[model samples]
Target: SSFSGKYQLQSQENFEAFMKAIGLPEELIQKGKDIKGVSEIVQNGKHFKFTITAGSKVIQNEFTVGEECELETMTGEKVKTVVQLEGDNKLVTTFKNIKSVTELNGDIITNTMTLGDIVFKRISKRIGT
Candidate 1:
C-alpha cells in the first residue's frame, strides 16, 4: 500500500501513569518512562502491522481492521481482540475494559489509550522511505 514508511515518534503524554494501570512491572516502566519509539505501519487490505522500537526493546503487533486478531500484550501475553473502524480509519479497539482510539491525519497517526479517566496519548509523523 505504498507503505513501508515508518512514523517517527513525536510526543507521548501521561504514558507512565497509563502504563501503571496496564499491570506492567515497575522494572519495565522505569526503563520505558522516557524512551523513544516508531509505528512502522503497513496497512494493506484492511490488515495492519505495527513495529514499535522502544530503544533496546522492540515490540510488534498487527491486526485486520475489522476482525478478531490475537494481539500480544506488553507482557508478551496474547489476547483476542477486535479492531473496529469508525470514521481512512478511526481505529477503535475495545477489549478487556480498555480502549484505544487512533486517528490518522495530515501525514501523522495519533494514538490515544484510555484506562478509566486516565489517558495516554501519542502522535507519530510519517517519514519517507
Candidate 2:
C-alpha cells in the first residue's frame, strides 16, 4: 500500500504527558489537545513530503530515504535528520533524541513516538484515499 494520502487523527494516547516530557509549554499542548489534526503526504519512491496541519499551524518535512535532511521541529528548531525504513513500509526518524516511527497499514496509520521515558501513540484513518 502506498502511504500517500490525507489522514485525520482518530485518537491519541499520552499526548499531554509526552509534550510535557519534551519541555513544550503547557499552553501549546492545551491548544492542540482537542483538535484532530490532519496529516498528508506525497510519496515518490524514496522521496517524500510529509505535512501535518494542526489548527492553523502547518508543519511540513521533506526527506529522502537514507539521506540527511533538515526537519523543522515543533519548537522552531530545524534539526538535520534522516528517515529510514524498518521493513518496507514503516518510516522512522529521530529529532533531538526523540524517535518517531510511523506505519500505514491498510487504510489506517499507526504512529508512535518516544521521549526518554514517555511513549506516545496516535492512530489515524485515511480521510481520502
Candidate 3:
C-alpha cells in the first residue's frame, strides 16, 4: 500500500489548530507553538517520521502504524501516545483467512494488535508446518 503524500507543519497557527482539535490544553499548545524548530511529517507505507524543532532542542520520533511513542510534554512529563491507524482506506477484494473488518472510534473492530502481540513469527505461529 501507498500513502497519499507528505505533510509539513507550516506555521504555529496551523499546528495549534490541529492540537486544539485533538483536545490539547492551552498551556501545552503555547509551548508547542513556541518551539522554534520546524516540524516535518513524512509517511512511508505504514511507518512515519516525525521531526520537531525548538531552541537547543531538536527531536525526531519515528513509529509504525501500530506502534507506541513517548513524547515529552512542556510540563516536564513524558506522555505515551500511540501512532496507530485502523481499517483499510482503500479496498482490496483479494485476501485469505481474513473476514470483515470495521473501525469505530479509532479502534479496529476485527483483527487487532496489542503491544505484546507484536512478537516474532515463531511465537505467533498457530501450527507447525
Candidate 4:
C-alpha cells in the first residue's frame, strides 16, 4: 500500500465547528489545537494515520477501517459514524448524507460547487479543516 500527499487543517474555526457539530467534547478541541497539521493526514488502503507535534510532546492516531463510533449532537440527535476512507480524496471520515450542493464558476464569491441542493461557493477555505 503506497501513500503520499498532505492535507493540512486550514482553519481553526472550521475545525472547531466540525467537531462541535459532530458533538465532540471540548477536551478533544483542546487536543486538536495543540497539534498542528492535523488536517495534514495520510491514508493507505484500509488504514489511515496522522501525526501531531506540540512542543516536546507528540501524539498520533493510526487506525484501520470498520472502526465505529457514536456521535450525539447538542440537539439530542444521535448518529453512528464509521471511520473509513471515502471519495477521490481518500479522506478518513464518516459517510454522511448530502446536505446540499452548489455549482461554481471560478469566482471569488458565489463560486458554487455542487454539493446537493446547496451551491457551495468557493469560500477560499478547506471544508474539512
Q: List the global CA lDDT of all models.
A: 0.79, 0.88, 0.40, 0.40
For 1-129, candidate 2 gives per-residue lDDT tens digits of 378999999999999998777776788899988789999989998889989999978999899999999988776679998999887679999998999999989889999999888889999999866
Better of 2 and 4 by TM-score: 2
The lDDT-based order of candidates, best leading, equals: 2, 1, 4, 3
Cα lDDT over the full model 1: 0.79
Candidate 3 residues 78-125, lDDT tens each? 555554554444211111221212122221111221222221110111
Please report the candidate that would top lDDT against the real structure.
2
Q: Model 4, 67-120: lDDT tens per residue?
A: 775533222355566654344333333324523121122221112222234332
> Could you give the candidate ranking by TM-score, starting with the highest?
2, 1, 3, 4
Query: Model 4: what TM-score?
Result: 0.36
Please list all clashing residue pairs in model 3, or write none if there are none: 37-53
Error of 4 at 99 (Å): 13
Q: List per-candidate RMSD values in Å.
A: 1.8, 1.3, 15.8, 9.1
Give per-residue lDDT, candidate 3, residue 97: 20
- Give lDDT: candidate 2, residue 45: 87
- Lowest-scoring 10 consecutive residues by lDDT in candidate 4? 102-111
Q: Per-residue lDDT of 31-106 in model 1, one digit per residue for the tens? A: 9877757668787868788888887777888898778998877666788999877866578896667788888876
Query: Once model 3 is optimally superposed onto the true structure by TM-score, how far is the C-alpha of residue 22 displaced, in angstroms?
Result: 14
Which residue segments of model 1 deviate by more than 4 Å? 1-4
Where is model 2 more than 4 Å wrong at Cα? none
lDDT, model 3, position 66: 60
